[model samples]
Target: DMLPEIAAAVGFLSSLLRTRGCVSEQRLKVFSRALQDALTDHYKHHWFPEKPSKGSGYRCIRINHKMDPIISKVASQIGLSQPQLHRLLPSELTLWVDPYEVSYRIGEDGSICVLYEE
Candidate 1:
């Protein structure tokens, strides 16, 4: 559940950072890996499990306003400008998708089903 927010945030920031020449690709990779690990740890420690809803429904993570601090932490870690991060509005940032699986890929461009491939 939490993975989507991290994934989307990293994806979005990576593009922004790249276009802005904010960091080298290698440094961006480091940021991505570090943030993913950081939030994975945060998820393990903080997120509580809930009962599944009654149907095999779509699963997603909502990037709500309250999560700003968590996202801001990573932004700070990467030395991203606060104004750049704040440029994103709440409605623009929320992610809604039914990902079959989530895997961190640095530069691969492939269909979403690629993760399911053996």
Candidate 2:
């Protein structure tokens, strides 16, 4: 089972730094600090003591079917190949809002898998 804190960190990476993915180790610290503040300042109020209730509303994003354009764009942004982009993706990008789950993956054969919803 995925832990909520892990999910939160993944969600932050995907939402705030989509193109970069988790490619930058230096940026990871920045992401952590930013999320720590966000958790304390924003999400703390939104979350209940243990975690968020079912009604808290999480908005999530998976890659779309037409991911080539996105892949091309992001590859350009990071100057990497599409193949590299495949490994650096979030299976599910999320948040506490509507549309709160996104499932995505690059199949072993290099085809898109789980475009949007799981």
Candidate 3:
């Protein structure tokens, strides 16, 4: 299940940080802290009893099969060969819908503005 409200809250925080010109490292910290607080608040208010996962090792992969060719092209543009790109994929190359939606725009000058919406 997707959490649109949570996504929107995170998105709003991202926008605020970007518009305020926060440094990358600082922005990352702020983002993490905000997300933690939001999740904590949600759990508290909802009286969720399940214990949350502790911070630990995990791997995340996002693949769009429909854009496989585009992925290859992008890797090429960045000087990576097709074989290198293939190596990046996990043993199982499955396409799964992301729970959160993050959208970004790249300006002509190369500045990136990312916003998340559920």
TM-score of each: 0.47, 0.35, 0.27
Per-residue lDDT tens digits of candidate 2, residues 80-113?
4555545565333323321223233333335332
In model 1, pairs of residues that clash are: none
Deviation of model 1 at 105, angstroms: 20
What is the model-wide C-alpha lDDT for candidate 1? 0.49
Ranking by TM-score: 1, 2, 3
Per-residue lDDT tens digits for candidate 3, residues 60-106, read 11233332443345435434455644443422232211234333322
Tell me the spans in candidate 3 whose CA falls farther than 4 Å from its real position. 1-67, 96-117
Candidate 3 yields a Cα-based lDDT of 0.38
For candidate 2, the TM-score is 0.35
Q: After superposition, how far is residue 8 of candidate 2 from its true place, in Å?
A: 5.2
